[PDB]
Design a protein around this ligand. Sequence first.
Ligand SMILES: COC(=O)Nc1ccc(-c2[nH]c([C@H](Cc3ccccc3)NC(=O)/C=C/c3cc(Cl)ccc3-n3cnnn3)nc2Cl)cc1
Length: 238
Amino acid sequence: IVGGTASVRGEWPWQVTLHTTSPTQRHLCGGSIIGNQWILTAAHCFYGVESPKILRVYSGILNQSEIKEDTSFFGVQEIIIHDQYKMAESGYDIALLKLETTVGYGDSQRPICLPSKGDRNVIYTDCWVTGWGYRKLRDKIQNTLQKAKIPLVTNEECQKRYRGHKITHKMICAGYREGGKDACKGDSGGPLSCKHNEVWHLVGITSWGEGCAQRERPGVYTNVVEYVDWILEKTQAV
Ligand SMILES: COC(=O)Nc1ccc(-c2[nH]c([C@H](Cc3ccccc3)NC(=O)/C=C/c3cc(Cl)ccc3-n3cnnn3)nc2Cl)cc1
């Protein structure tokens, strides 16, 4: 996260850190708890991941230093990538992780509500991006989970900012015109969380951008409201 500040423990209890153990264990991506065996994240995270056996999901984490060999984690039973996904810049950048065991909810880890289909017309004014990503292009994964408040940008304005790309309504953009606050490397897959009527909703999934927090280059997020039927199809299968 560029231009952000340290989060407080328990502030974003749906935020997870997804680690890969291959070749050595390290943070790979962010994700959000959406159900007791379900993590919503970005499809591009899994480039070259040949098996869910190499993945570890850690919840209830504020600091990456809390993770050692003896730290409990959730194994991944299945990786479900949207079958229209080709690359982050073309959309459908969404994936579900089906966990091997059930997440016990509490004050350190709980799910975030998905947006309502009726709320496709609501104007969100209190949106935050969170993650352990870089603070600039050439940096390193941060120990403490960071947060940044960022305004949503209309599809028309985002399209003007990304000449040469096709910004669809399945994408949602966020960022200040002058730049300064954004997601960066290591934040992808994490949530863009918006508070509306005192309830937090998972509005976006951190996906891509041209550089980090540059002027007139907002971050591009998967527009979660457009995928609620897909998520229910995969998580509520008979
Ligand atoms: C010790 O462990 C590590 O160092 N882990 C570690 C883990 C992941 C990374 C890492 N993650 C990423 C991903 C794409 C990826 C994922 C998975 C695998 C490989 C590529 N993009 C991101 O997060 C974020 C991209 C991004 C998003 C928005 Cl909304 C706006 C601007 C963005 N940007 C433009 N330019 N930048 N952002 N790149 C790097 Cl490098 C580094 C380091």
